Amino acid sequence: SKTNPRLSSLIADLKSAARSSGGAVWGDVAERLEKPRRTHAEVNLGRIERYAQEDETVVVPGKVLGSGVLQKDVTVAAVDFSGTAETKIDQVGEAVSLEQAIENNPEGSHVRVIR
Amino acid sequence: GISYSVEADPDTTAKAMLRERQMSFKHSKAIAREIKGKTAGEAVDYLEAVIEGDQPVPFKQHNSGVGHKSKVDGWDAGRYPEKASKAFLDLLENAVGNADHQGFDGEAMTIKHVAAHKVGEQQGRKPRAMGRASAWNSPQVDVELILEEP
Amino acid sequence: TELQARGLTEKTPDLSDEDARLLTQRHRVGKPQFNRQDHHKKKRVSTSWRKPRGQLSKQRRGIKGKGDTVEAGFRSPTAVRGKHPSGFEEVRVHNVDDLEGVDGDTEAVRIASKVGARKRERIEEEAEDAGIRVLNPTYVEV
RNA sequence: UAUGCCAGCUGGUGGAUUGCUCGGCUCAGGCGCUGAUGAAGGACGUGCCAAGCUGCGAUAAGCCAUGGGGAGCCGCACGGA
RNA sequence: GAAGGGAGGCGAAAUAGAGCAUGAAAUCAGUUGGCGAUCGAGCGACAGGGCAUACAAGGUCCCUCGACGAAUGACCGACGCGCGAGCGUCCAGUAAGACUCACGGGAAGCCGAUGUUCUGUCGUACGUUUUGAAAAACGAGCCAGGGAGUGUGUCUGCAUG
RNA sequence: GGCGCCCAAAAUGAUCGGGACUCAAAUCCACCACCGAGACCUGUCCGUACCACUCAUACUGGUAAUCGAGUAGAUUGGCGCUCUAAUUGGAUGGAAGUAGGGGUGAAAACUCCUAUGGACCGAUUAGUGACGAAAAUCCUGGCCAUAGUAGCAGCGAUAGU
Ligand SMILES: [Cl-]
Ligand SMILES: [Cl-]
Ligand SMILES: [Cl-]
Ligand SMILES: [Cl-]
Ligand SMILES: [Cl-]
Ligand SMILES: [Cl-]
Ligand SMILES: [Mg+2]
Ligand SMILES: [Mg+2]
Ligand SMILES: [Mg+2]
Ligand SMILES: [Mg+2]
Ligand SMILES: [Mg+2]
Ligand SMILES: [Mg+2]
Ligand SMILES: [Mg+2]
Ligand code: NA
Ligand code: NA
Ligand code: NA
Ligand code: NA
Ligand code: NA
Ligand code: NA
Ligand code: NA
Ligand SMILES: [Sr+2]
Ligand SMILES: [Sr+2]
Ligand SMILES: [Sr+2]
Ligand SMILES: [Sr+2]
Ligand SMILES: [Sr+2]
Ligand SMILES: [Sr+2]
Ligand SMILES: [Sr+2]
Ligand SMILES: [Sr+2]
Ligand SMILES: [Sr+2]
Ligand SMILES: [Sr+2]
Ligand SMILES: [Sr+2]
């Protein structure tokens, strides 16, 4: 039983999208976010660096942390970013919230789920 | 104590009541039962007859061990409660008195309602063998009487 | 010279053919008394239901004659559950403002019992004007 | 219909319940030694009438001084004088 | 009779009159309803009758006929089999068929409900011990009130932040 | 070969459950028709699981021949009690409590009416717990049957009228 109202709306949004638009990643991300917090992702830059490719939004069904180096110009969408992750990322790419990703890409196309 | 458990029209009725009398409650219950309906005058003649040993009081409820009495009608067990009887005569003496002071014909009035109520026991203690002491109490009885014009 | 109950005492709710069907069913079927086992054998044991827990309990083991045991199977129909026997949905009411939003066509009002004569008078008249029946109406001699 | 069974009514018995709190329980802050100049404790006295409590000590519910206080008072304790 | 009782007086109230706010149960007296001196015992549950019922907080219920009509499902008649009891084919998946509704008529102790009692079906408490409890195994006379997973520290999960 | 008969004695009153039964109401061989569960079939509803829609575990629609018993135990939603806070209500035109009665809920329980009472009482949400009893030869208090019963006689002191 999530207690955070925001995480709760974000989930309702992801669903509305996956159902209305051609989403599936969004419904897949909502699925995981509905599971308990220990299962949510905690990803450091190093991993996003190792598997991300330009022109393919990285979607982390959790929170992005700041260990390691990110040089690729990638747009990372996540539930949250640590103050440092958002900073290190903005230097080479763009950090956006899933609320925005669903906004520009309700069809959830050209995306890479990273955990 | 008790309060009259039955309504009584003042213009055609006279009341009386006994309070905390230490006497057999079981006897009271029996005497009441018996005189109910009788005339105050008749009830008094009856109670004097019991006291005298000429009229037995039917013991229908608390009759354990009591021996049969021929003069008892439609029942077998009976006795002659002289103490409780003298107490009802007192009650009746009060009732008829009040009745008269009001201008009624006391004796001629019908015992509309009469009932006894055990108000409590007076604590007593009797020493027994083996170092113990058991209860030895006296029942305390209230009794209500209502005289009604015929 | 005679007593008359204030308000729309005779008003009836308008139910779909189906709600009426189920309402009539609830009323036809009814249900067991569902009192506690053996409550009638010991004064110190009250009627309130307690699941029979004894390992040998006749009722617990379902012996015919020992009384039915509480199961979801006995639940009344959803479409009617909780309706007054008249078919109205009841709405507890504490004051005049509580009458606002109430649909007198399918809902009836029951003024809390704590409410006093002064405030009932206001509530009762205002409810009639809104076409709302009061389940516990004040009777006056008119 | 007796004796009687089950439920209710009226009245008892009983004192649960609800409401009330002069007492507790706990925490916190402050303060902190008394006694041969005979303490603490106890006994016995002490009131118009006085048994208990409280106070007091043959000056005995009190005596004196300074300040406060104030039209009333004679303790708990609503009596009589 | 400084008792108690009756009458009276005060007060909103004495059913506030002295362990004197409220006044439950066990239980007692009187009394009402039902049963009752030819009849049988876990005291009831479910269904159906009798009798009983001021109002309020429930308002339904009965009878004709008609509509709908699941599973199931005929009599009669006709024909054809069987030693016989009886069966087959057609009539016919028709008439009938629980519930529900409509028309017309009716009930106001009348329908529900509550009390009690009668009838039918089932039924030797409850909790515990035990492979096995109605148990000739253990516990309680009855009622009210009281009556059993709590704290600190440490460890290990888990949900949420 | 079939049925039977002898063999064949037990302690309160004989027995196939009983009555009782003889071309049977017995036994055996065939057959005919029926009665009889909660099983199976059928209507409606409930719960649960899964599906579709959905923010929803709220509605609504759909699927279950392949869902529906349960001790110990695991898991989950809910009822009720105290006091705190926030939001918001009721009460002398009568609160709480109690008694009797009506309505709802599978149920824990919620609610209304009448009487009594005569001053306090809730709801929602988040908390807080000395939070729920039929049981422990459980505790304390009160009360009934026992029962108008036993004792009020017995002793080397029979004591009175
Ligand atoms: Cl990582
Ligand atoms: Cl007695
Ligand atoms: Cl449910
Ligand atoms: Cl139907
Ligand atoms: Cl526990
Ligand atoms: Cl529930
Ligand atoms: Mg004798
Ligand atoms: Mg001794
Ligand atoms: Mg009981
Ligand atoms: Mg009192
Ligand atoms: Mg609120
Ligand atoms: Mg308790
Ligand atoms: Mg005896
Ligand atoms: Na005789
Ligand atoms: Na005789
Ligand atoms: Na000090
Ligand atoms: Na045991
Ligand atoms: Na047992
Ligand atoms: Na045995
Ligand atoms: Na005893
Ligand atoms: Sr007797
Ligand atoms: Sr009220
Ligand atoms: Sr008087
Ligand atoms: Sr048909
Ligand atoms: Sr089940
Ligand atoms: Sr089950
Ligand atoms: Sr199962
Ligand atoms: Sr407790
Ligand atoms: Sr006794
Ligand atoms: Sr003698
Ligand atoms: Sr002797």
Side-chain angles (χ1 to χ4, degrees):
Chain A
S1 54
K2 312 304 177 174
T3 312
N4 178 5
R6 311 211 93 214
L7 169 65
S8 173
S9 298
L10 167 49
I11 288 186
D13 296 335
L14 279 169
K15 289 181 183 175
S16 175
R19 301 164 171 179
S20 303
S21 305
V25 209
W26 302 150
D28 206 67
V29 171
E31 223 77 343
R32 165 44 37 65
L33 295 184
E34 261 170 348
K35 288 182 170 174
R37 281 175 76 113
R38 32 167 288 263
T39 68
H40 296 186
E42 311 162 315
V43 175
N44 287 294
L45 302 173
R47 203 192 292 308
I48 295 169
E49 173 68 52
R50 186 187 300 89
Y51 304 107
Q53 71 180 296
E54 290 185 47
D55 298 307
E56 190 189 64
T57 302
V58 169
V59 170
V60 183
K63 183 184 187 175
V64 184
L65 302 181
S67 296
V69 179
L70 183 69
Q71 306 176 303
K72 306 191 172 183
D73 170 47
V74 298
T75 295
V76 190
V79 191
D80 217 291
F81 310 79
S82 63
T84 284
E86 187 156 55
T87 279
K88 290 192 185 183
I89 288 177
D90 287 325
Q91 310 176 335
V92 297
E94 184 161 303
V96 311
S97 73
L98 261 58
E99 283 94 321
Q100 292 177 51
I102 303 173
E103 228 291 293
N104 323 309
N105 182 20
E107 293 73 35
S109 55
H110 297 284
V111 92
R112 171 89 49 186
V113 166
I114 301 296
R115 97 182 308 286
Chain B
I2 66 164
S3 285
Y4 297 89
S5 62
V6 179
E7 291 191 70
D9 188 319
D11 301 323
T12 69
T13 230
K15 296 176 174 183
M17 186 157 60
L18 286 180
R19 299 295 201 185
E20 294 193 294
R21 288 305 213 88
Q22 285 175 62
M23 62 191 191
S24 169
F25 173 57
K26 293 177 177 178
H27 293 168
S28 297
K29 183 185 311 187
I31 295 166
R33 175 181 306 116
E34 193 51 25
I35 73 175
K36 168 89 119 53
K38 285 178 160 64
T39 251
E42 305 180 311
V44 176
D45 284 307
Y46 174 71
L47 299 192
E48 295 182 307
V50 172
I51 295 183
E52 197 64 48
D54 295 326
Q55 203 70 55
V57 167
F59 276 23
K60 313 187 79 171
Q61 179 177 170
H62 311 291
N63 54 6
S64 170
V66 181
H68 299 178
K69 301 273 176 292
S70 66
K71 284 182 179 176
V72 167
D73 196 50
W75 189 243
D76 48 10
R79 278 183 178 168
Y80 315 78
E82 71 100 33
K83 183 170 178 179
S85 283
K86 295 190 181 186
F88 271 74
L89 281 179
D90 261 33
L91 188 58
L92 285 161
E93 180 199 68
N94 188 72
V96 166
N98 300 169
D100 293 326
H101 183 56
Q102 295 170 56
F104 285 117
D105 193 9
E107 310 188 304
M109 273 177 275
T110 303
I111 298 180
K112 179 187 185 64
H113 177 270
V114 62
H117 303 92
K118 175 165 161 182
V119 166
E121 296 187 331
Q122 172 176 270
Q123 246 73 307
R125 218 68 185 163
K126 164 79 89 179
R128 291 302 207 112
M130 321 306 282
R132 86 168 186 176
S134 52
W136 203 262
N137 308 322
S138 319
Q140 299 188 292
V141 188
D142 269 19
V143 47
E144 42 170 354
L145 177 66
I146 301 183
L147 293 179
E148 180 187 54
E149 277 191 293
Chain C
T1 312
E2 76 170 310
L3 294 181
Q4 300 269 298
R6 297 176 179 168
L8 311 168
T9 279
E10 303 305 298
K11 189 167 184 178
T12 297
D14 56 332
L15 304 158
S16 67
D17 290 309
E18 193 61 1
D19 289 318
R21 191 176 80 74
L22 298 184
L23 183 72
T24 304
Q25 189 179 85
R26 184 185 75 176
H27 176 263
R28 183 205 321 135
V29 172
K31 59 187 171 182
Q33 302 190 58
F34 287 119
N35 294 323
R36 196 185 181 177
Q37 85 181 317
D38 282 26
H39 78 272
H40 64 96
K41 290 170 154 178
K42 212 69 171 169
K43 285 182 184 293
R44 69 162 176 268
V45 181
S46 70
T47 225
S48 169
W49 176 262
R50 287 300 109 97
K51 172 186 193 179
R53 312 263 205 168
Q55 299 291 139
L56 305 175
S57 177
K58 310 296 171 293
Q59 193 187 75
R60 204 214 97 242
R61 293 160 41 188
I63 267 51
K64 182 207 291 177
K66 295 299 178 179
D68 293 300
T69 224
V70 173
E71 288 179 292
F74 287 85
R75 275 291 212 177
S76 64
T78 273
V80 167
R81 197 178 299 166
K83 272 183 169 60
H84 180 276
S86 70
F88 272 119
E89 277 296 345
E90 296 202 18
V91 177
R92 192 92 177 308
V93 106
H94 302 275
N95 51 241
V96 180
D97 286 301
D98 286 314
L99 290 183
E100 183 154 49
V102 175
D103 174 7
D105 272 25
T106 59
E107 301 179 304
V109 159
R110 185 159 226 135
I111 308 172
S113 62
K114 197 173 297 185
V115 183
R118 178 197 290 138
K119 189 170 294 182
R120 273 177 64 71
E121 186 171 55
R122 278 167 190 151
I123 297 177
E124 278 171 284
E125 64 180 303
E126 205 77 306
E128 198 183 307
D129 291 316
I132 314 179
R133 171 182 170 191
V134 159
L135 299 175
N136 58 312
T138 292
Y139 287 68
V140 179
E141 13 43 56
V142 183

